Amino acid sequence: MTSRDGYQWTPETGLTQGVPSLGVISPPTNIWDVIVIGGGYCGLTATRDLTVAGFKTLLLEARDRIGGRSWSSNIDGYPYEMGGTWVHWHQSHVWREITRYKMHNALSPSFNFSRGVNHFQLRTNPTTSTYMTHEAEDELLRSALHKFTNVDGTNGRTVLPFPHDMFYVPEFRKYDEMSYSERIDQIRDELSLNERSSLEALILTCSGGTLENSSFGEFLHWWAMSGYTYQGCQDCLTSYKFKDGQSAFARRFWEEAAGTGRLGYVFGCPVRSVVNERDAARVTARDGREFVAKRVVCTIPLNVLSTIQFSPALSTERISAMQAGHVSMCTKVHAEVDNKDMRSWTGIAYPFNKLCYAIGDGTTPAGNTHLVCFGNSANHIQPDEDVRETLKAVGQLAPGTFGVKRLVFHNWVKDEFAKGAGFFSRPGMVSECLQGLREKHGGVVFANSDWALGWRSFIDGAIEEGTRAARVVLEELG
Amino acid sequence: MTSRDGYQWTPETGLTQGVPSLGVISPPTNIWDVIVIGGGYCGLTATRDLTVAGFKTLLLEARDRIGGRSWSSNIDGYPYEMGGTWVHWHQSHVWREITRYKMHNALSPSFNFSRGVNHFQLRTNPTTSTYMTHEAEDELLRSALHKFTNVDGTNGRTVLPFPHDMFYVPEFKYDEMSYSERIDQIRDELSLNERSSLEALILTCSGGTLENSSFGEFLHWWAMSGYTYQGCQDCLTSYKFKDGQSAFARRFWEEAAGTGRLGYVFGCPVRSVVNERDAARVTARDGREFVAKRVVCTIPLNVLSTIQFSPALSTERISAMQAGHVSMCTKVHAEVDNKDMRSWTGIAYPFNKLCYAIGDGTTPAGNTHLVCFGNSANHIQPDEDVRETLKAVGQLAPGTFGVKRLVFHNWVKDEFAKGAGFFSRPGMVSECLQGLREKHGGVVFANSDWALGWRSFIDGAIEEGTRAARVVLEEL
Ligand SMILES: Cc1cc2nc3c(=O)[nH]c(=O)nc-3n(C[C@H](O)[C@H](O)[C@H](O)COP(=O)(O)OP(=O)(O)OC[C@H]3O[C@@H](n4cnc5c(N)ncnc54)[C@H](O)[C@@H]3O)c2cc1C
Ligand SMILES: Cc1cc2nc3c(=O)[nH]c(=O)nc-3n(C[C@H](O)[C@H](O)[C@H](O)COP(=O)(O)OP(=O)(O)OC[C@H]3O[C@@H](n4cnc5c(N)ncnc54)[C@H](O)[C@@H]3O)c2cc1C
């Protein structure tokens, strides 16, 4: 079935809107102890746990599909990941689900260095390139990340020995409150143009944001979770994905919950408001339908929360985090290209290009190379707005070496039910607001990867919070 | 509440059997869809999942306590860890249960390098000692581990890139190699200090001999932890529960009890499990019988050959259960009278019966706590002779301290474990893992000893109990 979300470009079709996904649900409805709002991995986990536990549970989702910020579209036999893609066995919650659903053997490596150009292309201005081996690229990035993360002499192991508890060492706060830009100022003279340029392209790819608005300590938190090394980051952040696409993973949550007979759902049904009453909570759809339950688990993202009317009023901390919003305006564009030899190419083009980091990520059945490309707020592009501009950005990663047969993307920035990609905090935002983002609010439990403790902003964080939400409901309802 | 398990020794009281544990269940009984045999983490996870899901579940346990190969004993306000101890957030299953139980902030570091002697004491013969900084110790072990693991150019990343699927690269002959054969290939590139360090470390993991420990199984621990020395440190020996493993076991127990669908009997060892046409029948040593539609059997690999199963098990199960795994790990705690040894570590190898030890804590009375390990190459049964056990301890740092207390449990002689944590013979995992995992009519065999990931860890137990509950759920 084909979803309203996403885009494709080919020479024969031009830009078209809406792409196939296994996440699309048919029919869109089948009609309460609990209402779960939103069917990303947070809502899916929570729904899976509550129904399995005996609770009569109703899923309300705005879109036509499950998966939220993470979903895949099969096109000519190749799964394009529109959002969240990479996982690893060091990510506790997603891994626990992969293995429980027997999908531990259903992964593919993104990297494949076994043939082709087998080099890293670094571009620091528009007219020229530098080329290196992947070993050389590793030495350059490790050297840069070393200097970047070494604020305590142990690359963050002293200030943040327990990433799940940011305040164990109170000096950590100073870094949460520091921006990319501030940190770089302290090491600027110790970095080459090549180390600085790679570093910034890489950390801005993580944050989606700008050097001024991304929290250095949020990055130290990612670093710490991955084991405080460059190799641990590579492994956790961009090495392994689902051979059949993320939406096949989401379908396992969905089939489990459906299979209980305790699941109610409605898709294409955006929520306008959630009001606490005496016995219960009343949820109102934009289309005016109404639904009542003893508890509501609300998994709407941080950047979307200000569109919803809550009663009573949220706290000051919830209000200001939601008004400032997180900074990830990440653009992710997929290109199926006609150069077979670029399977083993990787590339950074920074700061002059609207896509700054890219990798060869696979081979389609038709034998073309699949490139995935990322850009951020520091040099932003809305990839749907001018196909010719998007193609320039893709080609400037490796000028004069391929033609594009196809583009595939979803625009997370203009999507009204995301308004941003995965969470990434402003300087000071997590230390100031995390506690307020996680607290109870009547019979409303707020749960989203955006405010997880461990892998915050990943699929793993979304599953952590879905699990938490289910346990809170379980304790309170019995 | 005291357990039949464990031992304690002091100068004043001598050697006494039985020690306290939060894991002791009293009253032992409260009397089916499902019978779970075993109350270690595997069974606890399986029971927690089955109950929460609505199944009428019977738990039968041989011991007077839950936790199996992992439990803690609170003595004068200090948790002694009789078996499985360390966890990390890179261990998916234990970490998931830790955060879901809100215990993510209830851990503490074993290592404290802020005061005290702050050195590593290496002993390669009975008459001397070499002393280093902890930095130099890290350099020495990193160098030894690099040479040991570097079979493929990338420290195992090429032959074992997906530890959960050992056959992904067929070249992964390493499973069929012993510690001994691996060291033979790199013998000439290792100094005495690198070799002694390395052998002590690797034998502390396996609890076995150089000739009977799979090199490949070690490559697997090493891959699971990230292929680095530092990753092994983080995963294997850094963080433990402030309140002891038994307080974590209690959370699973309270959750399953709270459902109202839990039946249970402790001190109830099982002799047979028979598959009938409708159900499966489980008979205790004393003759009591219990019937369920399904059975989750979590008895350890080394105890299985004591059980009659109907019908016969595959040749693979039988071979593995008859050969057994090689971990005969001896683990000894000492409360000692030297405060400066909080930051001490030592290896004494090959001449001592405990070869590896660390400052792990400080009791409420203000004394240093040392945890000490021995293997099968120079083995001691710590209960047989207290004075030999004290000597084994003293010789880790001769002349530097007196022993106020010992605490330990003999896992080897324990009829419901017959070994410690799983660790395999060369080839045993290649040959038998598939067998050890296949269904047996109405009986699901689950145990950390044949998990795919953190096999032989607490994590591996929770992996397997989760699997078992998914399987039973799928079938009923
Ligand atoms: C481009 C991109 C790349 C990423 N890369 C990775 C990666 O490699 N690895 C990784 O682990 N993570 C990655 N992430 C992040 C990960 O995908 C998300 O953090 C995770 O999916 C968040 O899940 P969630 O359930 O907390 O929130 P969401 O998936 O955002 O789910 C929230 C749900 O609420 C619904 N909703 C919104 N408004 C309403 C409303 N008004 N009424 C009803 N429903 C509503 C939404 O439609 C959505 O279904 C990436 C994200 C993006 C966007
Ligand atoms: C000394 C030592 C140190 C270790 N170090 C660590 C560590 O640091 N970190 C870590 O993660 N792991 C460690 N391990 C491993 C970890 O403790 C075990 O792998 C894990 O606890 C096993 O869990 P399990 O539920 O699969 O097996 P078990 O805990 O062995 O449970 C099996 C249950 O079966 C019961 N049983 C046996 N026979 C019968 C019978 N006939 N009838 C009824 N019941 C029976 C047993 O009493 C037991 O309760 C260690 C183990 C030991 C011994």
Task: Please answer yes or no on whether B107 and A471 come within 8 Å at the CB atom.
Answer: no
- Boundary-marking domain end, from B396, B415, B434: B415
- Which residue has 């109350």 as its token pair? B39
Does A65 lie in the same domain as A213? no
Q: Do A453 and B95 touch (CB under 8 A)?
A: no
Boundary (domain end) residue, out of B364, B399, B415:
B415
A99 and A115 share one domain: no
| Nearest partner of B358 among B112, B188, B48, B169, judged by Cα | B112
Name the minimum distance, in Å, from the CA of A406 to any CA of chain B. Answer: 32
Number of domains in chain A: 2
Rounded Cα distance, B39 and B46, in Å: 9
Is residue A375 lining ligand 1, measured as CB closer than 6 Å? no
Nearest-atom index, ligand 2, CA of B306: 41
Q: Kindly report the number of other CB atoms within 10 A of residue A410's CB atom.
A: 26
Residues A292 and A185 in one domain: no
Can you tell me which atom of ligand 1 is nearest the CA of A272? Answer: 41
- Report resolution in angstroms: 2.5
> Is B96's CB within 8 Å of A93's CB?
yes
In this structure, are B320 and B251 located in the same domain?
A: yes
Identity of the residue numbered B85: T
Q: Tell which of B395, B415, B435 closes a domain.
A: B415
Residue length, chain A?
478
**Strand locations in A260-384, DSSP E?**
263-266, 271-276, 281-285, 290-293, 295-298, 309-311, 331-337, 346-349, 357-363, 369-375
Give yes or no: residues A250 and A227 share one domain: no
Tell me whether residue B276 is exposed, middle or buried, using C-beta atoms within 10 angstroms of its C-beta: 0 to 12, 13 to 18, 19 or more: exposed
Q: Which atom of ligand 2 is nearest to the CA of B94?
A: 11
Rounded distance between C-alpha atoms, residue A349 and residue A201, angstroms? 8
The encoded tokens of residue B404 equal 């106020």
Residues with Cβ within 8 Å of residue B436, at least 6 apart in sequence:
B301, B316, B317, B320, B445, B449, B450
Q: Which ligand is nearest to the CA of A449?
A: 1
Structure tokens at B446: 């689950």
Of A21, A66, A70, which is best to mutate to test ligand 1, by the most ligand atoms within 8 angstroms of its C-beta?
Answer: A70
Chain B CB contacts of A99 under 8 Å are: 92-93, 164, 452-453, 463, 466-467
Q: Between chains, do A231 and B228 touch, taking CB under 8 Å as contact?
A: yes
Name which of A419, A425, A161 is nearest A304 in CA terms: A419
DSSP string across B74-95: EETTEEEESS---B-TTSHHHH
Q: Which residues of A touch B453 (CB under 8 A)?
A: 89, 99, 104
- B185: containing domain: 109-238+325-415
Same domain, B123 and B220: yes
Tell me, in angstroms, the distance from the centre of ligand 1 to residue A332's CA: 14
Round to whole Å and give the CA distance between A397 and A375.
Answer: 11
Q: How far is the CA of B232 from the centre of ligand 2 (A)?
A: 21
Minimum Cα–Cα distance from A455: chain B residue: B89
The C-alpha of A143 sits at a distance from chain B's nearest C-alpha, in angstroms, of 18
Q: Do the chains contact at B231 and A235, CB–CB below 8 Å?
A: no
A107–B162 CB contact, under 8 Å = yes
Distance (Å, whole) CA B326 – CA B376: 8
Instruction: Name which of B397, B382, B385 is nearest B336 in CA terms.
Output: B397
Pairwise CA distance, residues B174 & B182, whole Å:
9
Dig out the tokens for B51 from the structure. 């109950």
Q: Indicate the SS3 state at residue A241.
A: strand
Nearest to B470 among A90, A100, A467 (CB): A100
C-alpha to C-alpha distances, A397 to A349, A359, B56, nearest whole angstrom:
6, 10, 61
Closest ligand 2 atom to Cα of B420:
53
B276 plus B318 within the same structural domain: yes
Are B397 and B282 in the same domain? Answer: no
Ligand having the closest approach to the CA of B5: 2
A92 and A6 in a common domain: yes
Q: Which helix (H) or strand (E) holds A21?
A: none
Same domain flag for B379 and B434: no
The set of residues, in sequence order, having a beta carbon less than 8 Å from that of A359 and lying 6+ positions away, is: A110, A111, A238, A345, A346, A347, A371, A372
Taking an 8 Å cut-off on Cβ atoms, the answer to whether A89 and B93 are in contact is no
Contact B5, B230 (CB under 8 A): no
> How many Cα atoms are found within 13 Å in the side-chain-facing hemisphere of B151?
27
Q: Please, what is the Cα angle at B60 between B59 and B62, to 5 degrees?
A: 145
The interaxial angle of helices B428-437 and B215-224, nearest 10 deg, is: 70
Same domain membership, residue B318 and residue B355: no
Residue with CA nearest ligand 1 atom 31: A40
User: What contacts B203, CB < 8 A, 6 or more positions away?
Assistant: B179, B209, B210, B213, B355, B375, B376, B377
- Using an 8 Å CB-CB cutoff, list residues of chain B that contact chain A: 52-54, 89-93, 95-96, 99-100, 104-105, 107, 109, 161-165, 224, 226-228, 230-231, 234, 452-453, 463, 466-467, 470, 473
CB contact under 8 A, A227 and B231: yes
Q: Which residues line ligand 2 (CB under 6 A)?
A: B 37-43, 60-63, 68-70, 83-86, 269-270, 298-300, 303, 329, 331, 411, 416-417, 420-421, 447-448, 456-461
Give the 3-state secondary structure of residue B212: coil
**In chain B, what residues touch A162 (CB-CB under 8 Å)?**
105, 107
- Looking up residue B462, the CATH number of its domain turns out to be 3.50.50.60
Q: Do B105 and A162 touch (CB under 8 A)?
A: yes
Closest alpha carbon to A264 in A63, A56, A466: A56
Here the CATH number for the domain that contains residue A405 is 3.90.660.10
Q: Report which of B398, B424, B399 is spatially closest to residue B327, judged by C-alpha positions.
A: B424
The nearest CA of chain A is from the CA of B307 a distance in Å of: 28
**Cα–Cα distance for residue pair A262/A258, rounded to 1 Å:** 7
Q: Edge-to-edge, what's the strand order for the sheet holding B262-265?
A: B262-265, B57-60, B34-37, B294-297, B443-445
Q: Give the position of tokens 């529960």.
A: B241
Q: Is A420 in the pocket of ligand 1 (CB under 6 A)?
A: no
Please tell me the distance from the alpha carbon of residue A438 to that of residue A440, in angstroms, as a whole number. Answer: 7
Report the residue from A53, A99, A227 with minimal CB separation from B453.
A99
Q: Does the CA dihedral A110-A116-A120-A123 come out positive or negative?
A: negative
CA distance B279 to B292: 6
Question: Do A234 and A163 lie in a common domain?
Answer: yes
Q: How far is the CA of A275 from the centre of ligand 2 (A)?
A: 49
Residues of chain A found within 8 Å of residue B91, distances taken between Cβ atoms:
92
Question: How far is CA B257 from each of CA A250, A477, B60, B455, B464, rounded to the nearest angstrom?
Answer: 32, 16, 14, 28, 21
Torsion on CA atoms B388, B394, B398, B403, rounded to nearest 10: -130
- Say if residue A462 is exposed, middle or buried (CB neighbours under 10 Å; 0-12, 13-18, 19+): buried
DSSP state of B443: E
CA of A36 to the centre of ligand 1 (A): 15
Closest CA to B342 of B376, B325, B366: B366
Contact flag B466-A99 (C-beta cutoff 8 Å): yes
